[PDB]
Amino acid sequence: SIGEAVFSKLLKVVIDEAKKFKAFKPLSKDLVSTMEILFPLTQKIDSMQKELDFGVKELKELRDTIERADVAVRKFPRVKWYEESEYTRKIERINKDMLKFCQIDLQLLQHRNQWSHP
Amino acid sequence: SIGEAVFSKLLKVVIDEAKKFKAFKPLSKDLVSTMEILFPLTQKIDSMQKELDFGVKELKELRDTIERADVAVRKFPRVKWYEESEYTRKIERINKDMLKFCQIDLQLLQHRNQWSHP
Amino acid sequence: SIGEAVFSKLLKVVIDEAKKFKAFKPLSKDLVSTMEILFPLTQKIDSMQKELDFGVKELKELRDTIERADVAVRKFPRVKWYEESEYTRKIERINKDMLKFCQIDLQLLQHRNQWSHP
Ligand code: NI
Ligand code: NI
Ligand code: NI
Ligand code: NI
Ligand code: NI
Ligand code: NI
Numbered sequence: 590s591i592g593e594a595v596f597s598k599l600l601k602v603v604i605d606e607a608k609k610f611k612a613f614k615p616l617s618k619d620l621v622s623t624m625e626i627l628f629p630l631t632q633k634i635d636s637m638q639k640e641l642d643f644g645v646k647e648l649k650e651l652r653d654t655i656e657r658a659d660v661a662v663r664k665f666p667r668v669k670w671y672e673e674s675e676y677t678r679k680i681e682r683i684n685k686d687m688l689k690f691c692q693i694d695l696q697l698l699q700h701r702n703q704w705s706h707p
Numbered sequence: 708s709i710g711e712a713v714f715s716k717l718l719k720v721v722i723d724e725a726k727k728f729k730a731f732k733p734l735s736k737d738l739v740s741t742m743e744i745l746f747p748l749t750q751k752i753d754s755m756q757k758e759l760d761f762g763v764k765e766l767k768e769l770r771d772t773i774e775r776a777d778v779a780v781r782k783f784p785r786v787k788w789y790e791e792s793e794y795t796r797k798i799e800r801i802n803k804d805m806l807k808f809c810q811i812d813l814q815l816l817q818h819r820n821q822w823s824h825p
Numbered sequence: 826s827i828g829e830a831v832f833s834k835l836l837k838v839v840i841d842e843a844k845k846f847k848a849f850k851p852l853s854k855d856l857v858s859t860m861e862i863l864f865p866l867t868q869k870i871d872s873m874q875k876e877l878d879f880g881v882k883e884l885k886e887l888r889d890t891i892e893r894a895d896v897a898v899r900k901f902p903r904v905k906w907y908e909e910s911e912y913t914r915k916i917e918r919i920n921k922d923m924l925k926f927c928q929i930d931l932q933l934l935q936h937r938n939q940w941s942h943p
């Protein structure tokens with residue numbers, strides 16, 4: 590019930606970097622709104638570091654979606670103007686993935702971790 | 708009835724700089740059209756340098772609106788593509804302000820300058 | 826009925842350069858589609874290097890249209906964002922010209938070249 594923060598730490602970095610691009614709304618409004626929804630769920634996943642193992646496919650895909658947001662945010666300053674639509678579509682799909690992840694059943698997650706299955 | 712040009716000089720500079728960005732129409736069409744409407748009014752304000760004092764709040768705001776146009780024009784080459792909407796809104800409001808100023812009653816201006824009031 | 830390739834060589838260069846800008850569709854979809862339609866016609870014009878002389882006004886304008894595509898493609902990386910509409914219109918007209926050229930009557934061309942006229 591207490592945890593050292595890693596998912597939530599890596600997510601707060603991505604939020605603080607995205608917020609800087611106020612003029613570009615798919616990042617600073619849409620994506621940070623989704624990421625701020627997802628942020629408490631990352632906090633309580635990190636608090637459950639004992640009951641969960643972060644290797645399962647759901648948490649590995651959480652890692653990978655937050656890392657796609659990270660990579661996209663860090664490359665934004667070099668997105669050329671004629672890549673706008675392209676990049677926006679990419680940002681939107683990151684957004685959608687994060688939202689679907691926010692429907693994760695944590696109790697079933699730690700359940701499947703405490704007891705073996707087929 | 709004869710004046711050394713200062714409002715109109717600072718406005719002609721801003722016009723000649725804005726005109727250069729032919730591809731970007733909010734500057735080179737819309738803003739220079741408004742500024743070319745306002746330009747003769749600046750000429751006759753400068754010709755009246757005796758009857759008016761340029762310290763009153765209307766002429767200080769004329770100074771400040773022409774200076775917002777100046778600053779915006781000089782920063783345009785470094786407006787990034789995802790700031791377009793933002794910058795355009797700013798340019799539009801400069802435009803609107805200039806137009807409203809072109810309804811200034813000069814006779815009431817020099818009147819309030821020749822005789823004291825409460 | 827066999828020819829060393831020059832129109833078609835200069836056109837293949839322009840195609841391979843335009844294709845690189847995948848994100849920008851007026852170039853990499855629209856213009857290369859038109860140019861790939863025009864490409865076999867350039868091949869068979871080059872194969873007919875004996876029966877035709879490339880000096881006539883139709884083939885000189887083929888030269889000049891392919892060279893406008895070349896110049897436009899090579900300058901694209903320095904098209905600023907607020908020139909988009911402008912440049913796109915230019916690209917579109919190159920496109921239209923190429924398409925109309927693809928209605929050239931080659932038989933009448935080599936005919937007017939084999940026999941003198943007024
Ligand atoms: Ni937060
Ligand atoms: Ni990262
Ligand atoms: Ni003028
Ligand atoms: Ni200034
Ligand atoms: Ni080809
Ligand atoms: Ni060339």
